[PDB]
Amino acid sequence: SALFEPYTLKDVTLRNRIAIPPMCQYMAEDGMINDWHHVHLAGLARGGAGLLVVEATAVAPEGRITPGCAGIWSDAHAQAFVPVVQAIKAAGSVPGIQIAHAGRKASANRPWEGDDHIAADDTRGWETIAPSAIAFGAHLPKVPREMTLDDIARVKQDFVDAARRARDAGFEWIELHFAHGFLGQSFFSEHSNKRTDAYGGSFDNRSRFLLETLAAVREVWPENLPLTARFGVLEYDGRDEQTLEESIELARRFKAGGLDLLSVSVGFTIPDTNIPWGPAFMGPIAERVRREAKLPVTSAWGFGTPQLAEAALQANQLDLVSVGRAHLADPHWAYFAAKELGVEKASWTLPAPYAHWLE
Numbered sequence: 001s002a003l004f005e006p007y008t009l010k011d012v013t014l015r016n017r018i019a020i021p022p023m024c025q026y027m028a029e030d031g032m033i034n035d036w037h038h039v040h041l042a043g044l045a046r047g048g049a050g051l052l053v054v055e056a057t058a059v060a061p062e063g064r065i066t067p068g069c070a071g072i073w074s075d076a077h078a079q080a081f082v083p084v085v086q087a088i089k090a091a092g093s094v095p096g097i098q099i100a101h102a103g104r105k106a107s108a109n110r111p112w113e114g115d116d117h118i119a120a121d122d123t124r125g126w127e128t129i130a131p132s133a134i135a136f137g138a139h140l141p142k143v144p145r146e147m148t149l150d151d152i153a154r155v156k157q158d159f160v161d162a163a164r165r166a167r168d169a170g171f172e173w174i175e176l177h178f179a180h181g182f183l184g185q186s187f188f189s190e191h192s193n194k195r196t197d198a199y200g201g202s203f204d205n206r207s208r209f210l211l212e213t214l215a216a217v218r219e220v221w222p223e224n225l226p227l228t229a230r231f232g233v234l235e236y237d238g239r240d241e242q243t244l245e246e247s248i249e250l251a252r253r254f255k256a257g258g259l260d261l262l263s264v265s266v267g268f269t270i271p272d273t274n275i276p277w278g279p280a281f282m283g284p285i286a287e288r289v290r291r292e293a294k295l296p297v298t299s300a301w302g303f304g305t306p307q308l309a310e311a312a313l314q315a316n317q318l319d320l321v322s323v324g325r326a327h328l329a330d331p332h333w334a335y336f337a338a339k340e341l342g343v344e345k346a347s348w349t350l351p352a353p354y355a356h357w358l359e
């Protein structure tokens with residue numbers, strides 16, 4: 001099976017092509033992770049996936065999505081990850097982390113606590129920042145503060161510090177969160193970026209925050225460990241061919257700047273869109289980016305059906321298959337997939353204290 005073939009990227013070898021993508025847990029306190037995350041992540045690693053990417057972890061307090069988001073904006077925050085990293089490694093999975101800044105979509109409630117911007121008089125809330133003072137709208141009506149050049153320098157440095165911290169905590173894989181309408185994505189999109197300085201207007205200017213952040217992170221992130229990013233390559237906003245073309249150009253510049261793999265997603269930059277949700281619906285777009293930027297890719301949404309994951313790999317649409325919600329439902333999804341695909345000794349996807357009994 002293609003799904004259970006190993007994958008080598010730089011010095012890191014994944015035992016199979018199953019990636020667990022970043023999934024916010026909303027269980028941290030002032031950015032500090034705790035035994036929620038420890039057990040969640042170690043349990044997933046033991047389930048058999050080759051790569052486990054820790055949830056969006058804020059590079060700065062105001063870059064959290066919610067009051068429950070993880071952070072890595074101090075060395076104490078980073079140190080909290082060390083035992084979890086060590087547990088993921090003990091289980092034979094590769095520990096990754098997504099470092100993030102939520103931009104104008106920050107200061108929101110947890111998804112089961114309203115999922116909306118925090119009310120003005122709620123002591124938990126904070127001012128958001130963005131390339132331009134324009135609200136997302138809908139359930140995220142707060143108008144962000146327009147970033148100064150010093151803010152841009154500071155946030156880039158926060159990404160650098162976060163990457164340094166992730167390195168020193170023992171992560172073997174990093175993902176820059178430039179997708180899903182958060183700060184990076186919003187610098188790229190003309191919907192959200194109305195700047196007239198070096199960081200807006202033209203394609204080069206809109207790309208600049210993302211490329212400069214990648215280059216700055218590259219200085220401190222080891223060359224022998226995969227350097228990746230998530231990026232929304234279209235919005236389903238009636239501008240898809242032009243947006244895709246630009247996104248693919250940016251992917252080429254990412255590759256030239258040392259990016260090893262791109263997690264291809266949707267932008268979610270604005271609410272007024274028409275996304276054609278369906279099983280593996282991003283497969284063909286991921287394939288186009290892979291082909292036209294000549295860059296390894298992953299993607300997500302509905303690949304928890306093992307045969308569909310297998311088909312996407314065999315069609316060379318993807319290099320890794322990201323499987324999210326199916327792993328919340330069943331942390332041992334990789335074992336289920338091995339069984340479904342008829343892999344020999346499927347139960348040994350799991351560690352011996354499980355595998356022996358399930359043969």
Ligand SMILES: Cc1cc2nc3c(=O)[nH]c(=O)nc-3n(C[C@H](O)[C@H](O)[C@H](O)COP(=O)(O)O)c2cc1C
Nearest residue numbers: 021022023024055056300301302303322323324325
């Ligand atoms: C609980 C939850 C939290 C998520 N948090 C993030 C995250 O931290 N960063 C990210 O880029 N995507 C996040 N996503 C998107 C997932 O990585 C993934 O793309 C999405 O769930 C689709 O894959 P699936 O159909 O296999 O669940 C999250 C989704 C879920 C379900």
